[PDB]
From a paper:
gC1qR/C1qBP/HABP-1 is a multicompartmental and multifunctional protein that undergoes spatiotemporal changes in its distribution in response to various cellular and systemic stimuli. Chief among these is oligomerization of the gC1qR monomer into a toroidal, ring-like trimer.
To address these limitations, we used the existing crystal structure of mature gC1qR to design individual deletion mutants of Loop 1 (i.e. gC1qR-D1) and Loop 2 (i.e. gC1qR-D2) wherein the entire acidic loop was replaced with either two or one glycine residue(s), respectively. We collected X-ray diffraction data to 2.2 Å limiting resolution and solved the structure of gC1qR-DD by molecular replacement using the published structure of the wild-type gC1qR monomer as a search model. The asymmetric unit of the crystal contained a single copy of the gC1qR-DD polypeptide from residues 76-247, aside from two discontinuities in regions connecting α1-β1 (i.e. residues 98-100) and β3-β4 (i.e. residues 138-141) due to weak electron density in those areas. Although the final model contained only a single copy of the gC1qR-DD polypeptide, the structure of the gC1qR-DD trimer that exists in solution could be reconstructed by applying crystallographic symmetry. The structure of the gC1qR-DD trimer superimposes well upon on that of wild-type gC1qR, as 140 of the 165 Cα positions align with a root mean square deviation of 0.544 Å. We found that gC1qR-DD behaved as a trimer in solution and this arrangement was likewise visible in its crystal structure. Intriguingly, we found that surface-captured gC1qR-DD bound with low-nanomolar apparent affinity to both FXII and FXIIa. Thus, while gC1qR-DD clearly bound tighly to both FXII and FXIIa, comparison of this mutant to wild-type gC1qR strongly suggested that interactions of these ligands with gC1qR are mechanistically complex and likely to involve multiple contact sites from each binding partner.
Numbering used by the authors:
A (entry chain A), B (entry chain A), C (entry chain A): 76 to 97, 101 to 137, 142 to 247
The structure:
Amino acid sequence: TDGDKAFVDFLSDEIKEERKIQTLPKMSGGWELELNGTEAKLVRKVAGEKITVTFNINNTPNFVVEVIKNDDGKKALVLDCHYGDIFSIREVSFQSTGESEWKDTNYTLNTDSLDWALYDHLMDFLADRGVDNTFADELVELSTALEHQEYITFLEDLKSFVKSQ
Amino acid sequence: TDGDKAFVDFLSDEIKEERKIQTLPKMSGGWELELNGTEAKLVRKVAGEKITVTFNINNTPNFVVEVIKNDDGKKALVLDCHYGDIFSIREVSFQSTGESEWKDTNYTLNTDSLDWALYDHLMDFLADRGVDNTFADELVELSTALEHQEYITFLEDLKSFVKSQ
Amino acid sequence: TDGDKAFVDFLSDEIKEERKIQTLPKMSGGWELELNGTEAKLVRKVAGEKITVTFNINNTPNFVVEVIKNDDGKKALVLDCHYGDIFSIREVSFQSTGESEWKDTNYTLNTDSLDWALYDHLMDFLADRGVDNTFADELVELSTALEHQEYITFLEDLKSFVKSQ
């Protein structure tokens, strides 16, 4: 098709321009990064605790913190958080680790009009585990670089797709 | 951690205050209550019919009515309803009982601009089965008490979690 | 019940009125139609390509285009599209064919502020495969007729349900 091979030439140009524009920055705090396509996991084991921060660059942007007390590995404290605009906690609950789905029947603390004092203690709980406003600022730029890399990979996949046959 | 044990002391105070503030009221109509964490089920078997009202106190608040004609147990009439502000029916469809998921391919009657006459007959159909505005008012206070009990249980779980180690 | 048999008589009247008001139009372009209740699939195999347009009349209205290059059947280009108001592409990604779920970890091109030039090439890519504004206009009337047929079937199912016993 005329359109297809022109679309391929155009995608070639876009890939050059976006690579030229340019890598992944680091997170302070001894985190280890695990990439699964658009999903990133930052991991820290400290003092009988595993802390996992999970975000997906496809999506208001959010990240999920999972705190596992290694004494009792079946139930994790899960804190859904906003980042970018403001940091802030949106929801807290206990979940089974490694489930295919949030148990809808476990209680979820929505923070919408939450007592400022309980809210601040929750923020301090996160800060003590490394998830502070510095972490949230560093996450923005990691997320931003990761989105650009995956977008470039997508243009390549699209170019390869359209050029096949 | 300094913060952790202070967070525990604060949660201790909150648990006392919320229990002090204070149980589950009853539903008129011979309903039986089954609690699964934040999900409640109210059940009635009357005249060849099983009526199940399901709501989850995590979440505009809604409840689902499931009518099963005991002659043909495979397909249930499902009425998604709003409660609190106004009663009102939001959606009606037939679903297989005991499915893991709403069959997306079964027709769903959205009530958004629904003929008032069909709407009123649907309201009368529910009222005949006990789901009236009295039921919906009683549900608000049952839901409200159930949310408070589960929130108290959550503070205890949080306090226990943070205090461990 | 008094209400039930009156509801049955009323549903009888509604079914007559809606059938009286009146079938499924055709899609230009050699498409084959497969109905699964409220989900419709339009299918075309052309030049080493399978094109599938899927929409569900329950639901802003949208349809999904799936392009499979028969050389490599494991990954399909998926274009989520709006129809009715404007045509337009909302999201593009690669997905495994025949999955139970969108892989959340595959990159999704949201078109929200997308470069007009990449957007137009995507529109041309669809148009070359038959998904043009003519197709989208024809789809509106197919969807509209299909919703009416399924609604009539729903009134019959409701009438049959309420009349049983």
